[PDB]
Curated annotation (Swiss-Prot):
The gene is folA. It catalyses: (6S)-5,6,7,8-tetrahydrofolate + NADP(+) = 7,8-dihydrofolate + NADPH + H(+). CDD domains: DHFR. GO terms for biological process: dihydrofolate metabolic process; folic acid metabolic process; one-carbon metabolic process; tetrahydrofolate biosynthetic process. Key enzyme in folate metabolism. Catalyzes an essential reaction for de novo glycine and purine synthesis, and for DNA precursor synthesis. The lineage of its organism: Bacteria, Bacillati, Actinomycetota, Actinomycetes, Mycobacteriales. It comes from Mycobacterium tuberculosis (strain ATCC 25618 / H37Rv). This is Dihydrofolate reductase. It comes from the Bacteria. It is an enzyme of class 1 (oxidoreductase). GO terms for cellular component: cytosol. Pfam families: DHFR_1 (PF00186).
Length: 166
């Protein structure tokens, strides 16, 4: 759907109902259904992540396979084997389609350029706590479809939102 001369930027994240996406350097739930969803959307694309999200990736999927991994860091000497490290968002968003995959800092940086958000809401009542990474706030310029609740294999409930804007 994307003309090759354009620059589509999308954000994709999974959040608790409270907006928590990250805590203690990790994602504070386990949801294989969301991993599969994230993989289906991002496979084959350039993905952009902050350095702390690179650190948070399980070693088995660091780099995330089948995607061009781009890591934003101000550390010139940062070691991200199998990825590329860029010092600015400008060098990160050169592809016709980019998926920004976290974390809290980088979603805030990228949201003003984005025209798609793919959001998984996890029906888990984790209260926001000091130091948590949080999902970005979407204003009224965004619109989209809210999916139905589904139970994961474990009985954890989740639903998918597909948002877009002009
Ligand atoms: N639930 C989800 O969908 C999801 C997805 C992804 C991540 N997470 C979780 O979110 C947390 C990580 O989020 P976070 O907000 O703490 O960190 P982050 O956004 O992943 O990374 C922050 C790092 O990115 C670099 N950075 C930020 N802005 C930059 C800029 N303008 N230019 C160059 N570099 C920049 C800096 O790296 P340097 O310090 O190296 O300079 C900064 O420390 C983890 O808990 C992770 O597991 C959740
Ligand atoms: C899955 C978490 C997540 N969900 C959404 N909706 N958006 C995100 N940005 C997001 O974070 C992505 C970075 C953390 O990714 C993971 C963390 C723990 C386990 C597995 C993966 C992915 C591995 S995968 O499914 O992409 N690839 C293979 C080969 O498993």
């Amino acid at each position: 759907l994307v003309p090759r001369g354009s620059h589509m930027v999308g954000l994709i994240w999974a959040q608790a109902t409270s907006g928590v996406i990250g805590r203690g350097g990790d994602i504070p739930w386990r949801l294989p259904e969301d991993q599969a969803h994230f993989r289906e959307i991002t496979m084959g694309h350039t993905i952009v992540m902050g350095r702390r999200t690179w650190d948070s990736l399980p070693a088995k999927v660091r780099p995330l396979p089948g995607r061009r991994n781009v890591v934003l860091s101000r550390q010139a000497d940062f070691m991200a084997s199998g990825a590329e490290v860029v010092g600015s968002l400008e060098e990160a968003l050169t592809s016709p389609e980019t998926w920004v995959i976290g974390g809290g800092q980088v979603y805030a940086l990228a949201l003003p350029y984005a025209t798609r958000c793919e959001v998984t809401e996890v029906d888990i009542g984790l209260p926001r706590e000091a130091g948590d990474a949080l999902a970005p706030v979407l204003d009224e310029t965004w619109r989209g479809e809210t999916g139905e609740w589904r139970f994961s294999r474990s009985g954890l409930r989740y639903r998918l939102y597909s948002y877009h804007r002009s």
